[PDB]
Design a protein around this ligand. Structure first.
Ligand code: HEC
Ligand code: HEC
Ligand code: HEC
Ligand code: HEC
Ligand code: HEC
Ligand code: HEC
Ligand code: HEC
Ligand code: HEC
Ligand code: HEC
Ligand code: HEC
Ligand code: HEC
Ligand SMILES: *[C@@H]1O[C@H](CO)[C@H](O)[C@H](O[C@@H]2O[C@H](CO)[C@H](O)[C@H](O[C@@H]3O[C@H](CO)[C@H](O)[C@H](O)[C@H]3NC(C)=O)[C@H]2NC(C)=O)[C@H]1NC(C)=O
Ligand SMILES: *[C@@H]1O[C@H](CO)[C@H](O)[C@H](O[C@@H]2O[C@H](CO)[C@H](O)[C@H](O)[C@H]2NC(C)=O)[C@H]1NC(C)=O
Ligand SMILES: *[C@@H]1O[C@H](CO)[C@H](O)[C@H](O[C@@H]2O[C@H](CO)[C@H](O)[C@H](O)[C@H]2NC(C)=O)[C@H]1NC(C)=O
Ligand SMILES: [Ca+2]
Length: 658
């Protein structure tokens, strides 16, 4: 940026690439040395690193916490700076060059150059007769003698003629020209190659520019380990069937460890983290062939359920993945080219629809692996027809609606919710109401998706990388909020928060229903009944439900998971008895509540009709509309429900009959 230019004193072209048509030839004053923003200010504004991708120096600057890397063209010519750069470019450790101090001399530049070019065997190939071609060669310490002559034969450094003799000047301070000529030879041997569009960079490289250090603690990047990662806490001496050296990989989950042999098949024991013990395990699959495609990152082609993380040379397997675990690029795609340029057009972002659930569903497919079912097509057993998971169609509900507006995407659109939150972060003190002025309903293309409820990047303490406490997550959208005692049937919408918390609001004070009606099933959470065992069907069993997932069933890309389309759970047996509490017992309460609300709404559209304006029939309409819009048949709060129906069956014979 222009700010980084001031902070560093560097030209734009130092960190940013400039078009070929701008390049200065040596001596020439091309556009790459002029004020970019004077000329581009208002004709082709420079706004993005897609226009001006980073040079190597820009990359290093950004990897160094936006501080300049050491540059031998400009910085103090210390032994330290020379080793720092010679090491970086070569990939050697800074220690392979040894102890270091003072400013660089011609003889130790020749030494560092031998290390960096890894030419110790080419330097030992010179003999005492080669050395003697030089008058002052003995004026160099023994370590640097042969190297200084090798460097002069190779032309990296020069000698000088004086009369009939040639001088190396081994103790002269190396000039900037000689350091740079040596650095260029290191750069020639290890040239910086543009990565292919399909190459992967590794999570650690992504973090070196973006940060995201808390990502390293989520379970995604930790799915696959090697045994040394666990130190000595596996208590290997208690394992009588295998040892750490028999193990190729450890499959690492929150509660259990699985172990993968040298032949990639699972091992007879698992490690139970809670009881600190080797237990027996009956997995025998080949992990590489059957499992790795969702557990690793970086192999050619699509990843996830259709992925191929290996190749098989007859009988031996070759691993094609380069990162164990689910790294950044498992969602953002191959990022090596992006990581070498900072070019946003070379990585998957929101502009590519990464927030769509498909980013996650290729591993969380919705059969054995939870999440994907939330937007699938269901055949609920005993109910004819089929139905789509309604969080999936949340947006096209607003698109298909006559009074469909932008205000509604607050709870119906993922790309609206992030767009809005971006506008409040750029224009502080502006509200939700006047962001809607900027956008038409048609701009937005996503309903509710995985990242509406889950963060892909961090765990904030709520479990399952959720953004909020589970109840608060559901209640943020399933609130009515504001509706008063005189709102009526058609004026109270999704009041689940208020019914379930038993808090209808102040204006219900006058009607004798207390400020807080404690819920007899209030020790349950929304997820207890709507998401048993982590299922995202959200359909409640009464008490049990059986679903055939037709999206799973009719998708051959799922392989052997296509046959696992049946889901079955009990929404109530955490508290109610598993066998004794049955559909008949539940149908009793549920019919009995449906009956009582219908006979309040029927005999208020029939007999008491056109009392429509009586502020005494609006009460009995609201009080019975709440039990209807809540749509739980009073299960969300059995005690608030009967106190609502009684105070509504009373308020109808307390009306003016006509
Ligand atoms: C998009 C398809 C996804 C994917 C891949 C996942 N989710 Fe969810 N999720 C939500 C809540 C409240 C929970 C906790 C459930 C509970 O308490 O039992 C979950 C759980 C998960 C899991 C873990 C499942 C388990 O075995 O316990 C996983 C792997 C997962 N999710 C992935 C909330 C929501 C949503 C709010 C309506 C949405 C949308 C999603 N999740 C979407 C997805
Ligand atoms: C290295 C010290 C830099 C110099 C000198 C200049 N830029 Fe820069 N720029 C640099 C980095 C590492 C980045 C990415 C920052 C990020 O976190 O995204 C940028 C970015 C830009 C952009 C993109 C828009 C933006 O991020 O605000 C522009 C338009 C840009 N830089 C312009 C620019 C100009 C005009 C410069 C010369 C005055 C210049 N940069 C120098 C690194 C460095
Ligand atoms: C006028 C004297 C210029 C100054 C100074 C800079 N730029 Fe330029 N730029 C200019 C023109 C007339 C054009 C269009 C013709 C062309 O050569 O393309 C451009 C184009 C660019 C682009 C377009 C993308 C591309 O062709 O690769 C970029 C990214 C660009 N210019 C960048 C750029 C930078 C970084 C500058 C400061 C070093 C700079 N321009 C100065 C005119 C002029
Ligand atoms: C410094 C050389 C970087 C490395 C290494 C990585 N990224 Fe990057 N990224 C960088 C810049 C200067 C920018 C543009 C400014 C910005 O921060 O938006 C980006 C952008 C992204 C994006 C957003 C893309 C978009 O559509 O807007 C993503 C999703 C992203 N980067 C991810 C990412 C990944 C996965 C990386 C490892 C392969 C990675 N980045 C490395 C700079 C640098
Ligand atoms: C394959 C490359 C995956 C993609 C893409 C996504 N997920 Fe994932 N996820 C995957 C595995 C193999 C695991 C188990 C990790 C382990 O070490 O046990 C997970 C885990 C999760 C979890 C559970 C986290 C927890 O606290 O237990 C969640 C909530 C989750 N994944 C969500 C999620 C989202 C939202 C994704 C899209 C942004 C996504 N995953 C993609 C495999 C893969
Ligand atoms: C799937 C489980 C993901 C993995 C692993 C990583 N990212 Fe991610 N990223 C993902 C999604 C679905 C989104 C869109 C977020 C939204 O709510 O719309 C992103 C976004 C980013 C961005 C954009 C800007 C920002 O949020 O700061 C960046 C720069 C980014 N992601 C970088 C990033 C890095 C560095 C990762 C490894 C440490 C990484 N992502 C992993 C999905 C997933
Ligand atoms: C992509 C379709 C996958 C394949 C193929 C395999 N696994 Fe998996 N696994 C996947 C996800 C998305 C998750 C987390 C989300 C969820 O619903 O569990 C997992 C999780 C595991 C775990 C941890 C379970 C736990 O108790 O938390 C284990 C131990 C595991 N997976 C093992 C495993 C094996 C043995 C596989 C081959 C038979 C296998 N997985 C394949 C995604 C995918
Ligand atoms: C969060 C506070 C919401 C806002 C703002 C809007 N809607 Fe919504 N809507 C929300 C929920 C939690 C539900 C389901 C509740 C339930 O009882 O099942 C809905 C549902 C709808 C429907 C479906 C109608 C039905 O099946 O009975 C429609 C047609 C609908 N919503 C439209 C809609 C419009 C037009 C909005 C802007 C005026 C709007 N909603 C805002 C949550 C929220
Ligand atoms: C806004 C991002 C929401 C959050 C967070 C939760 N819900 Fe939701 N839900 C929302 C809408 C807008 C709709 C209906 C839209 C439509 O197209 O009709 C729903 C739907 C439900 C349903 C009905 C599901 C069905 O019949 O298929 C249930 C049972 C439901 N929602 C429950 C629920 C739970 C338990 C939540 C926390 C885990 C939750 N919702 C969050 C909006 C949003
Ligand atoms: C068990 C005591 C439950 C708890 C806790 C919560 N819900 Fe519920 N809900 C439950 C049942 C038995 C039903 C009837 C739906 C059916 O399948 O017949 C519902 C209904 C809903 C709905 C409407 C869904 C629909 O079918 O239209 C919504 C939107 C809903 N529930 C949301 C919700 C919220 C936000 C909760 C926490 C405050 C919550 N439910 C808890 C059973 C139970
Ligand atoms: C533990 C948090 C529970 C969950 C989960 C479910 N139920 Fe429940 N229920 C629970 C208790 C402790 C009681 C008795 C309350 C008392 O103190 O008397 C109940 C009661 C019922 C009833 C009868 C209510 C009445 O006659 O007034 C019904 C019809 C009922 N429960 C249904 C029900 C269903 C269908 C559930 C799954 C969605 C469910 N409950 C879950 C505790 C808990
Ligand atoms: C729901 O969305 C799905 C997206 O993958 C898919 O498009 C699905 O297609 C239907 O599949 C269901 C079973 O899951 C039915 O087979 C449905 O059946 C047909 O519906 C069509 C027209 O609506 C067609 O005319 C068929 O004759 C009719 N069958 C019946 C019930 O008599 C499939 N649709 C098609 C186009 O084949 C989507 N289901 C929907 C939209 O209901
Ligand atoms: C290795 O990878 C293959 C998939 O690409 C197969 O999984 C193959 O399975 C085994 O096939 C061999 C012949 O190649 C035998 O017929 C085995 O019976 C069969 N596996 C089992 C246990 O039945 C895998 N091959 C190897 C070397 O395991
Ligand atoms: C439950 O709801 C009640 C009214 O509906 C009260 O708000 C009650 O709060 C408690 O009130 C009594 C006084 O009558 C005590 O003074 C308690 O200290 C007070 N609880 C606190 C500490 O706020 C509610 N009780 C609970 C525990 O939910
Ligand atoms: Ca799905």
């Amino acid at each position: 940026t222009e700010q980084y230019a001031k902070d560093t004193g560097k030209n734009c072209s130092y960190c940013h690439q400039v078009p070929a048509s701008h390049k200065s030839q040596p001596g020439q004053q091309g556009r790459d040395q002029m004020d970019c923003m004077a000329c581009h200010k208002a004709f082709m504004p420079l706004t993005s690193t897609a226009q001006i991708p980073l040079t190597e120096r820009g990359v290093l600057f950004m990897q160094n916490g936006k501080k300049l890397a050491v540059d031998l063209n400009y910085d103090p010519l210390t032994e330290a700076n020379v080793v720092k750069e010679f090491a970086r470019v070569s990939g050697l450790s800074e220690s392979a060059f040894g102890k270091v101090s003072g400013n660089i001399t011609k003889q130790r530049l020749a030494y560092f150059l031998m290390v960096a070019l890894k030419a110790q065997g080419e330097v030992a190939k010179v003999t005492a007769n080669d050395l003697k071609k030089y008058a002052d060669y003995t004026k160099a310490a023994s370590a640097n003698q042969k190297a200084l002559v090798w460097a002069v034969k190779k032309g990296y450094l020069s000698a000088r003629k004086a009369g009939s003799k040639l001088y190396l000047d081994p103790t002269a301070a190396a000039s900037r020209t000689e350091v740079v000529k040596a650095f260029n030879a290191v750069q020639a041997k290890y040239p910086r190659v543009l990565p292919a569009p399909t190459a992967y960079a590794g999570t650690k490289k992504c973090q070196s520019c973006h940060g995201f250090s808390k990502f390293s603690a989520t379970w995604h990047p930790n799915m696959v380990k090697t045994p040394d990662f666990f130190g000595s806490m596996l208590l290997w001496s208690l394992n009588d069937k295998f040892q750490a050296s028999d193990v190729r990989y450890v499959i690492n989950s929150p509660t259990e460890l699985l172990f993968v042999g040298k032949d990639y098949k699972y091992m007879p024991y698992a490690f139970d983290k809670a009881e600190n013990q080797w237990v027996a395990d009956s997995h025998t699959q080949n992990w590489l062939v059957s499992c790795a495609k969702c557990h690793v990152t970086g192999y050619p082609g699509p990843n996830g359920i259709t992925g191929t993380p290996y190749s098989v040379v007859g009988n031996t397997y070759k691993e094609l993945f380069t990162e164990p675990g689910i790294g950044c690029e498992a969602c953002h795609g191959p990022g090596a080219l992006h990581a070498a340029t900072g070019d946003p057009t070379k990585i998957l972002g929101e502009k590519d629809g990464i927030a769509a659930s498909a980013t996650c569903e290729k591993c969380h497919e919705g059969a054995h692996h939870r999440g994907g079912e939330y937007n699938d097509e269901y055949a609920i057993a005993g109910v004819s027809g089929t139905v789509y998971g309604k969080h999936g169609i949340s947006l096209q509900t607003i698109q298909k609606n006559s009074h469909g507006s932008v205000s509604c995407l607050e709870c119906h659109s993922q790309d609206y919710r992030t767009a809005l939150e971006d506008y409040l972060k750029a224009n502080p003190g502006k509200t939700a109401a006047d962001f809607n002025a900027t956008v038409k309903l048609s701009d937005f293309k996503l309903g509710i998706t995985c990242v509406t409820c889950h963060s892909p990047h961090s765990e904030k303490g709520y479990g399952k990388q959720l953004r909020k406490e589970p109840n608060e997550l559901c209640m943020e959208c399933h609130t009515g909020e504001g509706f008063t005692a005189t709102s009526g049937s058609k004026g109270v919408h999704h009041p689940q928060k208020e019914v379930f918390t038993g808090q209808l609001g102040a204006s219900f004070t006058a009607l004798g229903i207390p400020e807080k009606v404690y819920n007899p099933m209030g020790s349950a959470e929304c997820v207890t009944c709507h998401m048993p065992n982590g299922y995202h069907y959200f359909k409640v069993g009464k008490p049990t439900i059986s679903i055939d997932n037709l999206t799973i069933k009719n998708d051959s890309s799922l392989g052997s998971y296509q046959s696992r389309y049946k889901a079955s759970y009990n929404s109530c047996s955490v508290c109610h008895d598993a066998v004794g509490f049955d559909a008949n017992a539940v149908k009793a309460w549920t019919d009995k509540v449906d009956t009582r609300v219908n006979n309040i709404l029927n005999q208020l559209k029939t007999t008491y009709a056109a009392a429509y304006n009586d502020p005494n029939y609006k009460y009995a309409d609201t009080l019975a509309g709440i039990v209807a819009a809540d749509a739980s048949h009073g299960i969300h709060n059995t005690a608030l429900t009967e106190l609502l129906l009684d105070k509504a069956e009373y308020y109808l014979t307390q009306i003016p009959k006509q």
